Paper text:
The replication of positive-strand RNA viruses relies on virally encoded RNA-dependent RNA polymerases (RdRPs) that are capable of rapid and processive synthesis of the 7–14 kilobase viral genomes. To examine this in further detail and to validate the polymerase–RNA interactions seen in the initial poliovirus EC structures, we here present nine new coxsackievirus, rhinovirus, and poliovirus elongation complex structures at resolutions ranging from 2.1 to 2.9 Å. All of the complexes show the open conformation for the active site wherein the β-strands of motifs A and C are not hydrogen bonded together to fully form the RMM-fold that is commonly utilized by polymerase active sites.
Expanding on the r2 construct, the length of the upstream RNA duplex between the two ECs was shortened from 26 to 24 (r3) and 22 (r4) base pairs, and both these RNAs resulted in poliovirus EC crystals that diffracted to 2.4 Å (PV_r3) and 2.8 Å (PV_r4) resolution.
Residue numbers in the entry: 1 to 462
The structure:
Amino acid sequence: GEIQWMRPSKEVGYPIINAPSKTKLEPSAFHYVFEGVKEPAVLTKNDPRLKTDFEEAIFSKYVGNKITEVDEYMKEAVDHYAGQLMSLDINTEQMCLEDAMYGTDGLEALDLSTSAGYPYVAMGKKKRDILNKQTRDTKEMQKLLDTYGINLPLVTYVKDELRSKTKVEQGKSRLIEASSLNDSVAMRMAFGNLYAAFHKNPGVITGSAVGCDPDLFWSKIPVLMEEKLFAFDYTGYDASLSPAWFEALKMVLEKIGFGDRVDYIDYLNHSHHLYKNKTYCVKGGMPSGCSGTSIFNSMINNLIIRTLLLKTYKGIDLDHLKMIAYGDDVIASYPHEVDASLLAQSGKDYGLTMTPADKSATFETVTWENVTFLKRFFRADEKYPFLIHPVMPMKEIHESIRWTKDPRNTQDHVRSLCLLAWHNGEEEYNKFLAKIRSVPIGRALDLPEYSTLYRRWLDSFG
RNA sequence: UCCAGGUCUCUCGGAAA
RNA sequence: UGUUCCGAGAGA
RNA sequence: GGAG
Ligand SMILES: [Zn+2]
C-alpha cells in the first residue's frame, strides 16, 4: 500500500472535515488505584508530547507495494484455499437490500450509531435519517443508492484510544477509514451471504475466528489444531498489503461463485480519502473501515501463510495445515515443526514485514504456555483440564479501568472488565475486586463473585 | 452551547414485553 | 430460556 | 466541520 498523490481538498472541490481535536478519554475513579503507562493517542499535530512529525508518522504505514503479479505459489495457495471453502456450500446469491441493511441470520444490522460517511457527513445527515429498524424500510436507501451510486471516497479519522508512551512520542496514532453508507450497503448485497457463512463457521475450514466467543471457543481450538504450532506478528499488515494480494483474493472469490462482483475488490485496492483538509489516492492497502475488512483480511492471511509455506517448504501438503486468523492475528499449526524465522524472510519478497510473535525479541518456539490469540493466553481449568480459559493478562485490564470516556458508564465498564479478569483465577480476581473497592465508587458497584462466574462459565457449556 | 470519531465479532448491562 | 430496541467494554 |  502506497499513496499516489495528496493535495488540499479545496483544490479539487472536496469539503474539509473537522474531527474533534480533543480526546474523550478522561482519567477514571480508579486512575491511581492501578498502575499503568498508556495514555490517550495523539489526535492533532499542535500537540506538546509529540517528539517527531505527526502527519509524516501516521502515513508512514504506506511503505510501498512490492509485488504486482500473482506468482505460482500464490495461485497454488488460492487453489487450495478456494477448494477448502467450497466444502461449506456457501450461498452465492446477492443478499436483498432489506437483509443487507437490517441484518439476518449471521449478519447484524448496520450500526445506527455511527457516521454515514461521504457525503452525508458533509450535509449533517445520519444513518438515523435514512434507516429505520422498526419498519425495515428500504425505499429511501434505494433512492440514495440511485442518487450517489457507489465507490465513494472514504473519510479518514484518527482512532481516539489508549496508547504506549513510545507511540504517543513517535506519533504512531492509528487511522480509521469511514465507509460510505452507500458502499457499506453495496458490499452487503454482494457479500452478505459470504459474511453470514464465515460468521457461522469459525475454525479451520474458514481459517477465521470471526463469529466466535472466546469463552466457549478456546476449548474447541486445541482440538482443531495440529501438533507443532507456529505464529508471528505483522508490522503494518493492512497497509503493507499490495495489489497482487487483492488480485489473489479476487481469484478465490471468482472460484467460489462471487465472480460477477470482484470489481468491488478493486474499490478497496484503489481508494480515495478525505483527511481533514487534504485528499489522497492510495493503491494497495486494505482500508480500515470498509465493509468486509475483517472477513477479507483473514482470507488474505489464509493466503499469505499457505503461500510462504509453499515457497519455504517444497512439496508441503497444505491439506494438513490447521490455522485460524482474525485479520492479522493468527494461531497456526503443522504436524511437523515450522520455522517462523524462515517464513518471515520469504515474507519480504511479498512486501510483508513479519516479526516474532507477541513482541518477543527473537524467534523461538510457540507452545500452549506462551501462545496468544486475540490478546488471550490458553490455560486449562484446574478441575476440568479440557475446558480452556481464555486468559487476558491483568496488565491490559489495568490500563483500561484507569481511563473513561464517560463516568456514567463506570458500572458497565468495570463489570465487563471483571468478566475478562476472572480467568486469571480466584487469587488474582479477589485482589482485583479488593483494589476496585478501595475507592468509594468501587463499593458502589455490583460486581460478580468468582464463584458465580465459574459456575456460570461451566453452565454455559450445555 | 450541544453534536461530531469506521468496519465487524463476542460478551455484559438497561429497557420493553 | 427465547427474541426486540438501546447502552457499554474488549478484541481484530 | 455539522444544527441552533
Ligand atoms: Zn486514484
